[PDB]
Design a protein around this ligand. Structure first.
Ligand SMILES: CC1(C)CC(NC(=O)C(=O)Nc2ccc(Cl)cc2)CC(C)(C)N1
Ligand SMILES: CC1(C)CC(NC(=O)C(=O)Nc2ccc(Cl)cc2)CC(C)(C)N1
Ligand SMILES: CC(=O)N[C@@H]1[C@@H](O)[C@H](O)[C@@H](CO)O[C@H]1O
Ligand SMILES: *[C@@H]1O[C@H](CO)[C@@H](O)[C@H](O)[C@H]1NC(C)=O
Ligand SMILES: *[C@@H]1O[C@H](CO)[C@@H](O)[C@H](O)[C@H]1NC(C)=O
Ligand SMILES: *[C@@H]1O[C@H](CO)[C@@H](O)[C@H](O)[C@H]1NC(C)=O
Ligand SMILES: *[C@@H]1O[C@H](CO)[C@@H](O)[C@H](O)[C@H]1NC(C)=O
Ligand SMILES: *[C@@H]1O[C@H](CO)[C@@H](O)[C@H](O)[C@H]1NC(C)=O
Ligand SMILES: *[C@@H]1O[C@H](CO)[C@@H](O)[C@H](O)[C@H]1NC(C)=O
Ligand SMILES: *[C@@H]1O[C@H](CO)[C@@H](O)[C@H](O)[C@H]1NC(C)=O
Ligand SMILES: *[C@@H]1O[C@H](CO)[C@@H](O)[C@H](O)[C@H]1NC(C)=O
Ligand SMILES: *[C@@H]1O[C@H](CO)[C@@H](O)[C@H](O)[C@H]1NC(C)=O
Ligand SMILES: *[C@@H]1O[C@H](CO)[C@@H](O)[C@H](O)[C@H]1NC(C)=O
Ligand SMILES: *[C@@H]1O[C@H](CO)[C@@H](O)[C@H](O)[C@H]1NC(C)=O
Ligand SMILES: *[C@@H]1O[C@H](CO)[C@@H](O)[C@H](O)[C@H]1NC(C)=O
Lengths: 345, 345
């Protein structure tokens, strides 16, 4: 007795009420205390069809995250097409918290236990839980931060890999530490990545991509052009909006089981040139938000790159991928690809 | 105009008065609502001498937690010097709360901003606040739980490392989640700790220790012997006193930047065999307390290990370390190491 239906979920967090961070302020009020200990009702002999690409759970998370930011991150000015809104935009404590989206009474959640599931298609290994796994609702483009990893091998996910327009989600097995910091220019920041570990990565990745492509020089190039949010690694570090230049990160061709990169430092590390912008393009809505100038002191963010968002060109013997992002729904497909809300009816 | 002086402090809490958790009941009456927003008076060109081992802030916290427990955790019987004292020992709601220790009018607090300070010695990066940070008064041995982390690298702390008799406090930069549980034997419990995260941990931990030892085999072994409280990771989970076996956790030698452990399960998590005890040796005083039989139903503490309490053996090319603790002041030095009460006079 299982099927596919739409039900209004709810969130359960391990958030503190005494915490002044906006994620906790929102969580403790908008969310339920964690279980904190349910159990997986593992199932054999059963196979179900998942689709991380047409899943309501991702929209429900999307909406909550938007509302979270509405309360949390207030823009000084929110210009939505010739109409501007002003309001109190106080600097605040900001740092994502794991969220567990749970199913109402009478409903349950399916969990694919295939450690290689691409997030679309059948799955002979299933289970059941009331809540999900903790999910840091991290807004970022190009690079997926502080997410979960692929247990075994790298997994590649695309609604249609032959369509160059669909966004491709790379799930690493091994995270790459990344440390963006704004030292004591006040808007001038940077990020550090150890090439060595970035190399092993883009190799394993290229090798995985290569499996889906018969024999073409697989190249990684910077995002063609467009909005800074999408053409650079942009994210929110401590309420502040970092736009990290990535041209020295996605730069190298990996053909014939080989690996060759570009843009490095004598320490053996890749340095990204970031800026903390006030004028931003909202990921929640087609509009622009303006915030206050950076806070004082060291603004550093020690994150782990656990996933990638890419985009093939398509159109001879050379497939080139470019960093992508924009639709944050994908940032949350990368963590909800495993799940599927089922009706016990 | 600064110096080192003793003044009777006071605690400020974000505690609710409608709450029946013994922590809130004591707090709201013994403490004062949080500021809840003072400001750090950051300082440059100034260096001060801290000593987390000779700081009265800790002794005051000690006495308050003792009193807190005196009201909160009623033993059925309390035996001290052959003198037994009985009383109502009603099972109660128990869950620690962050405590901020503030300085009276006429005094301030010195806060070290150096993100690598070992708790003892000079510090060129100082600040000033009226209160402290949210310190959970968690009573535990061996492992430190629900505390703060070292922002950057792992910090090792000891009054004198060359003195084996001095306890070492390990500050982690990445906590290890620990979930202890007594399932629906009624005194029989257990704890789950993922190996991988404990492996990265002890490795990082041994590497730091190795920095303090030119060239020796660093071994981690269970406490030599003594009372359970001290020979096991004992703590309080919801009024229930758990004594968790740690022999499969502190069991592995790590030499030549290597890492080699012991005691594992098929799932990839270290399980610790716990017993819930009624008769316990008081951490507050030299005596024993007898508590009521464990409450019924699931008793779980989903907590984070943020530090360690260790003991080097003393006495060739082999430095062995064992889990220690017992004196709770250390548990509270681990968080008061940064602070130091100064007179503005
Ligand atoms: C909803 C929307 C208008 C948003 C757009 N993407 C963005 O501007 C965006 O993520 N900006 C952004 C990203 C990260 C952070 Cl931390 C702050 C801002 C992608 C398209 C244009 C497809 N639709
Ligand atoms: C003051 C004292 C008698 C206390 C002794 N340590 C303890 O009994 C102790 O931690 N007991 C204990 C610890 C944790 C919990 Cl949850 C319950 C009981 C350590 C020293 C040597 C300082 N002498
Ligand atoms: C591009 C991609 O990952 N899609 C595949 C899909 O073609 C296949 O049917 C499924 C197996 O169930 O695995 C996934
Ligand atoms: C990393 O992913 C590759 C395939 O993408 C896989 O072969 C490898 O096992 C993963 N990491 C490890 C465990 O080496
Ligand atoms: C994938 O995209 C290509 C190119 O747009 C399209 O022609 C093809 O029909 C798509 N295949 C699937 C799986 O729908
Ligand atoms: C990977 O980066 C490391 C960092 O020093 C470098 O030594 C090595 O040559 C690189 N290998 C590649 C690009 O395949
Ligand atoms: C790669 O980076 C170099 C500089 O490090 C740059 O000159 C070159 O155009 C980049 N190649 C691309 C766009 O892939
Ligand atoms: C990153 O810097 C390079 C070199 O200065 C520049 O060519 C590139 O356009 C930058 N990326 C963005 C989008 O700012
Ligand atoms: C990623 O998680 C780490 C650990 O919680 C945190 O320090 C870092 O700031 C996070 N990065 C963000 C905010 O995306
Ligand atoms: C960052 O990644 C490293 C390597 O996997 C890991 O040890 C650490 O716990 C990660 N921190 C976060 C943000 O979870
Ligand atoms: C900590 O560093 C100070 C110097 O700032 C040094 O005097 C002290 O011995 C160190 N403590 C230990 C034992 O690590
Ligand atoms: C903790 O310190 C270790 C080395 O001692 C380092 O590798 C790790 O990145 C640190 N964790 C952080 C900075 O979160
Ligand atoms: C842990 O359990 C073992 C038996 O497997 C026992 O010998 C040991 O004494 C226990 N822990 C301690 C040190 O009390
Ligand atoms: C370490 O633990 C193993 C079991 O995992 C046990 O057999 C052995 O006695 C322990 N050795 C010690 C306590 O050094
Ligand atoms: C740690 O905090 C968690 C959540 O507040 C709580 O459930 C747990 O009891 C705490 N750990 C202990 C045993 O103090």
């Amino acid at each position: 007795v299982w099927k596919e239906a739409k039900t209004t979920l709810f969130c359960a967090s391990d958030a503190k009420a005494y915490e002044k961070e906006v994620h906790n302020v929102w969580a403790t009020h908008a969310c339920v205390p964690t279980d904190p200990n349910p159990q997986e009702m593992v199932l054999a002999n059963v196979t179900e069809n998942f689709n991380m690409w047409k899943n309501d759970m991702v929209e429900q998370m999307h909406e909550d995250i938007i509302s979270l930011w509405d309360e949390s991150l207030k823009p000084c000015v929110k210009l939505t097409g010739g109409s501007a809104i002003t309001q109190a935009c106080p600097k605040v404590s900001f740092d994502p918290i794991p969220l567990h989206y749970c199913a109402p009474a009478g409903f349950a959640i399916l969990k694919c236990n295939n450690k290689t599931f691409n997030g679309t298609g059948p799955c002979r290994n299933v289970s059941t839980v009331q809540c999900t796994h903790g999910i840091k609702p991290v807004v970022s483009t190009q690079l997926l931060l502080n997410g979960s990893l692929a247990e075994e091998e790298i997994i590649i996910r695309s609604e249609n890999l032959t369509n160059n327009a669909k966004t491709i989600i790379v799930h690493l097995n091994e995270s790459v530490n990344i440390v963006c910091t704004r030292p004591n220019n006040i808007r001038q920041a940077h990020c550090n990545i150890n090439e060595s570990k970035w190399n092993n990565t883009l190799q394993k990745v290229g090798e995985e991509l290569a499996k889906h492509f018969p024999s073409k020089t697989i190249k990684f190039e910077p995002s063609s052009g467009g909005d800074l949010e999408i053409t650079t690694h942009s994210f929110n570090c401590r309420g502040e909006f970092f736009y990290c230049n990535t041209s020295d990160l996605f730069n190298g061709t990996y053909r014939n089981g080989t690996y060759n990169h570009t843009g490095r430092s004598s320490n053996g590390t890749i340095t990204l040139q970031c800026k903390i912008k006030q004028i931003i393009n909202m990921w929640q809505e087609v509009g622009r938000a303006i915030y206050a100038p950076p806070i004082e002191g060291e603004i550093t963010c020690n994150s782990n790159i656990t996933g990638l968002l890419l985009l093939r060109d398509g159109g001879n013997d050379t497939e080139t991928f470019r960093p992508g992002g924009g639709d944050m729904r994908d940032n949350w497909r990368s963590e909800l690809y495993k799940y599927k809300v089922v009706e016990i009816k």
